[PDB]
Design a protein around this nucleic acid. Structure first.
Ligand SMILES: [Mg+2]
Ligand SMILES: [Mg+2]
Ligand SMILES: [Mg+2]
Ligand SMILES: [Mg+2]
Ligand SMILES: [Mg+2]
Ligand SMILES: [Mg+2]
Ligand SMILES: [Mg+2]
Ligand SMILES: [Mg+2]
Ligand SMILES: [Mg+2]
Ligand SMILES: [Mg+2]
Ligand SMILES: [Mg+2]
Ligand SMILES: [Mg+2]
Ligand SMILES: [Mg+2]
Lengths: 85, 122, 86
RNA sequence: UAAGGAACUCGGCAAAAUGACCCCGUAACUUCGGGAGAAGGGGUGCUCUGUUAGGGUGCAAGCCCGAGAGAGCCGCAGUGA
RNA sequence: GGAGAGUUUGAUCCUGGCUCAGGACGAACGCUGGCGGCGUGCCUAAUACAUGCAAGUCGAGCGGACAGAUGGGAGCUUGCUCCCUGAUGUUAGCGGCGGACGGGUGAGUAACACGUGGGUAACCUGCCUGUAAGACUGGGAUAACUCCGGGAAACCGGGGCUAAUACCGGAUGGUUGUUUGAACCGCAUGGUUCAAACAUAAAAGGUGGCUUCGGCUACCACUUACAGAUGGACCCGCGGCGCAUUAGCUAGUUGGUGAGGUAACGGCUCACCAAGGCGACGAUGCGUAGCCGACCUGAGAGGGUGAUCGGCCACACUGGGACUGAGACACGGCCCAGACUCCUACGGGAGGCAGCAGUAGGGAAUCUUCCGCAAUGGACGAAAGUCUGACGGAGCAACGCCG
RNA sequence: GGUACCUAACCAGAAAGCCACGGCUAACUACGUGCCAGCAGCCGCGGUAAUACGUAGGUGGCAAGCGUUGUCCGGAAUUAUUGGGCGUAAAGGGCUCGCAGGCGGUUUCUUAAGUCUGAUGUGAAAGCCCCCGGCUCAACCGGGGAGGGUCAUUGGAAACUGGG
RNA sequence: CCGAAGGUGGGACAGAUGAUUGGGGUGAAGUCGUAACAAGGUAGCCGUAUCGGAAGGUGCGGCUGG
RNA sequence: CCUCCU
């Protein structure tokens, strides 16, 4: 099927305790509008992990979905990296 | 049966909410006033922004009482409360609206503007 | 109102609702019959109730009350309960 | 004890009112302890679910303590004195 | 594509503010005033409003009054009368569509409201125009009109009726649901296509003409599928205000599971579980604010503004709720409450100028109680046409820009 | 609306203005006041010879108006990213220890978030503007472009910043 | 059941106003002294304490901008 | 010790 993809993101798993759910933090370097320095921005996200596989440190990719709760808007597509301790 | 110190609800939109009876008018040692009698009174509670202000001495006509009133046919009327309407010397109400039912007795005393403005006259 | 067709639309819509409520009530009552039958363990009656339900459901769709998706949702819910009995 | 409600009186004197338990909630100010039961509110009988959950005792049977719920029932009024 | 000047001293250089020359405006006020052509004109009280007018239409749905008279009849003062229902006309009342647009105002809103972002696999989508099936067979009621009772009344309840393109019954219907499998797959939840069974679900005829009076038509038009299109709904990244002399906030709060609801995804609602979520990258609170196209200014960076004109949003005397539907949880509707206006013989009714004009009030200050749908665009209708303070014009005012 | 526009007389008749004139910024003398009366954007004028006040006569801009007050941007490299400072002009914290943060020697390999780059989609119409045309030029309307994104999506490059 | 308005209650916040009171600013020619500027006639100034109509004085420590 | 205002 020739489907246009939704906006996909990747980041570190900062939260996990919420079962069936995670917080993925897409850190990035937005330029400041006036002064032009790369400032360390960080957008948190809320994705879904049905199996409860992800943990602290996992640099997972997530893709947009139907609203899976009030805050949740994404799914755990794949655990790319698997950090431990 | 309203006497000195009786507090009344004000049944109008003049600004006064509660009045204290200073004097029953109409004779020297007159103890008690009933429906259709005029009283001098002070405003104890007022609505903020109203025409009539707290502390003003004013005339009011009693329009409902708990004691109520007897009619020549041997029937009576009573209300759950004592209430009056602030008036000018010509009997016209200082407010523009009357709240709650008033007694037929006000027609007899020629408080016509009040009787016309009242939602019910029993 | 203070318009001719407004006064008609006032008088019309009242008379429509009454008629309309009938059919919803009829539907909802017919839905309760199926729901009641699940408790008693009687599928044979639930099928014959589900037909009368489904009739009353679809009459509301025709008039312009129950949306097709709304009806779709109801007949789903009921049929799962009937099959869940057996 | 009608209506009124401190008009009484030197003075609310006397009387009335408040009053139990559980729950919510509680200001100024403060020596940071307090203030505080501040204030202001809500619940409270009986029946069934029900020898409830749970707890004590006991090998058990049993006995004892016992929330909080839901559904009802009655009265003007359930800490009905 | 970028200009400076005056002013601290007795005089000096510097630092440093202040002031001026420029442009802009919905301006106001003085004084003065000729005409013309385009444009602009409540920024204050989202204050209250007298009066009028601003959405009504379809008789080719409609029984019915009330007319029509082509003709016959018509007693007979030819003067007037008439008795039948002419083609068909006027269309209170019923039924349909529209009234959710167009118009107005920016009160609220610091929010996915907006400006630039997806599912379209989470949705909806009447009207319009296509391609694809049909209007077959049951009746039963109800306005008006009438009868009766009300209402001084305003308005209205019974009784017998009558119609409809109003409504309901049943068959067979691809839709829809369920199940039985397949086929094929995506971005996980899946999606798309096909076949049978079970279950459910359709319509409406009014005109003009021809009927071999069996019927067959055609514009309009009723109903069903796959489309396209159109207009809505949700979601998301990222953007764009002030105050820390606002540092903690939250308890349906954060996620789960289940149930319900919704066109639709979802604490959206609830039950039962846990204990989360947010925040120094400024949460929370307070203040202010419709956002955007743009506009003014400037070499530009920036700064300010968001009247007029276009788009998105929100609101409609204040506040709450649903009904009808493809679509308002309604701008000239209703239901309920509140404060105000009106009527009421007192029981009860009616309305909302942030529609055009206008009035009062506020204010430094902002128009005509105007003419016309001829034009453009709507709504209705097959059309003629009707309605249209939308709109076109004109009145007013040196308020601009320019002839 | 018998309104625009034409003809044709009465005929250039009906159609000139306001403000400013120390300096900034091109533009002066009588008289009457006498620190009074008054003036004033700033500097400042007037106490008995006022080129800035009251009056009277006299002149550069733009063109039925222009003065006055109000608001905004400029001038103001005067909140300074572009583009400023802190010995004495305003300005170094009294001095440490340090959490977060900011910043970080050299080589090499690898990565590719940042950085750069190609291609594709949208950023309505009006307005302002590039060529700009038409309406007699205008105080105005059309088309094709451009800008418009710290924006997607994808393919490269890999020095530099970041990660191993 | 939910539920607008209403009622009751105790808090929070903002504005207006208030007897009186506090300094502040400004104001051609008021009164008192003379603190500072010169070694300003006791070098001045900084912190702090205390005292005094008032500038100020005095102590302690500091600075040179003596 | 003080030295009116412009
Ligand atoms: Mg007593
Ligand atoms: Mg008593
Ligand atoms: Mg006494
Ligand atoms: Mg006494
Ligand atoms: Mg006592
Ligand atoms: Mg606002
Ligand atoms: Mg600047
Ligand atoms: Mg110095
Ligand atoms: Mg210094
Ligand atoms: Mg230092
Ligand atoms: Mg000295
Ligand atoms: Mg000395
Ligand atoms: Mg001493």
């Amino acid at each position: 099927s020739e489907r246009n993809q939704r906006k996909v993101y990747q980041g570190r798993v900062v939260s996990d305790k919420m079962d069936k759910t995670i917080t993925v933090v897409v850190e990035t370097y937005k330029k400041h509008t006036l002064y032009g320095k790369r400032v360390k921005y960080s957008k948190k996200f809320k994705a879904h992990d049905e199996n409860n596989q992800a943990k602290i440190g996992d640099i997972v990719k997530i893709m947009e979905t139907r609203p899976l709760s009030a805050t949740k808007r994404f799914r755990l597509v794949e655990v790319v990296e698997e950090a431990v301790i | 049966m309203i006497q000195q110190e009786t507090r009344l609800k004000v049944a109008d939109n003049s600004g006064a909410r509660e009045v204290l009876t200073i004097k029953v008018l109409g004779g020297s040692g007159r103890k008690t006033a009933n429906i259709g009698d005029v009283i001098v009174c002070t405003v104890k509670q007022a609505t903020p922004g109203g025409v009539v202000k707290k502390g003003e001495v004013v005339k009011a006509v009693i329009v409902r009482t708990k004691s109520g009133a007897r009619r020549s046919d041997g029937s009576y009327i009573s209300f759950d409360e004592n209430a009056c309407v602030i008036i000018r010397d010509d009997k016209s109400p200082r407010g523009t609206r009357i709240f709650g039912p008033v007694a037929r007795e006000l027609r007899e005393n020629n408080f016509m503007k009040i009787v016309s403005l009242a939602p019910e006259v029993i | 109102p203070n318009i001719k067709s407004a006064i008609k639309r006032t008088k019309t819509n009242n008379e429509r609702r009454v008629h309309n409520a009938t059919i919803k009530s009829a539907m909802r009552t017919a839905i309760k019959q199926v729901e009641a039958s699940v408790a008693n363990n009687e599928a044979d009656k639930a099928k014959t109730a589900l037909t009368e339900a489904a009739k009353r459901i679809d009459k509301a769709v025709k008039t312009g009350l129950v949306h097709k998706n709304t009806a779709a949702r109801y007949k789903s819910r009921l049929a799962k309960k009937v099959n869940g009995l057996s």
